[PDB]
C-alpha cells in the first residue's frame, strides 16, 4: 500500500471521449503532492500531464486542450481524453506521489493500454 487501481486496457471510440481510470484509497497521514500521466514512447515514458502545487499543466503538444484529469473526489485522478485520435493508441502511466507520516515520499505508478476503436 498504497496501490493504484488502473484497468489493464481501455478501448475508446474514434473521435469520441475516453476515460483512463486511475484511483486509490486515501490513506490516513498520506498527503498527495504530485500527479503525473505519462505516455510510453518506446523505452521511455513521456509526461503529458502534471498536477502540482500550482495546479494542472498539459505538457506535450499532442494533448493541448483535450486532456482533463478528475479532481473532485480524493483518490480519483482518472484521465479523460476527448476527440480520441488513432495515434492516441499507446500505453499510458498514471503516477501519484505522496508525503508519508514518516516525512518520506512514496511514488506509485500503474500502466494501462489505450486502444482506439473505429
Amino acid at each position, epitope marked *: 500500500r498504497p496501490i493504484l487501481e488502473v484497468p489493464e486496457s481501455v478501448t475508446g471510440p474514434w473521435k469520441g471521449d475516453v476515460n483512463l481510470p486511475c484511483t486509490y484509497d486515501p490513506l490516513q497521514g498520506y498527503t498527495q503532492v504530485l500527479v503525473k500521466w505519462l505516455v*510510453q514512447r518506446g523505452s521511455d515514458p513521456v509526461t503529458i500531464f502534471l498536477r502540482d502545487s500550482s495546479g494542472d499543466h498539459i505538457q506535450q503538444a499532442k494533448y493541448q486542450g483535450r486532456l482533463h484529469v478528475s479532481h473532485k473526489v480524493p483518490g480519483d485522478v482518472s484521465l479523460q481524453l476527448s476527440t480520441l485520435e488513432m495515434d492516441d493508441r499507446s500505453h499510458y502511466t498514471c503516477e501519484v506521489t505522496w508525503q508519508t507520516p514518516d516525512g518520506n515520499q512514496v511514488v506509485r505508478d*500503474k500502466i494501462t493500454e489505450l486502444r482506439v476503436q473505429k
Partner: nanobody
Amino acid sequence: VQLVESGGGLVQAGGSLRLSCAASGRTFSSYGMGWFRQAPGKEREFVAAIGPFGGSTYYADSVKGRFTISRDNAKNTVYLQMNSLKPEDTAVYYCAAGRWNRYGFEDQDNFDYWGQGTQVT
C-alpha cells in the same frame, strides 16, 4: 495466467545459479517483473525487479552486485543470475508480475500474478 519458476537447488557457497521464470498468457513485455524470496520462518523480502519496455533494473541491497535480473521478451521469460552466493541467500525464490512502470516494484501488493517458488540453498 501462469508463472513457472525453475533453476533452484543446493549450491556450494560462492557458486552460481540461473533462475528462470516462464510467463504465459499476455504480452508480458508491458509488465514489470520481480523476484522475491522468503527464508524459513522469515518474511517475504524483495530481491530484484525489471521494468516493462526498457530494461531498467532494481536490486535489494543484500543481493546487489551478486545478483542480476534479465528478460527475454520473445520467450516471455525473466532470469535471475545468482553469483557469489552467500549462505544467507538460502530461501524460496518467487517471480511475480505487475503493471507498475518505474515505481512501487518492492511493494508486494503491487504484483497481480505470482509463481510457486523455487528453493535455493
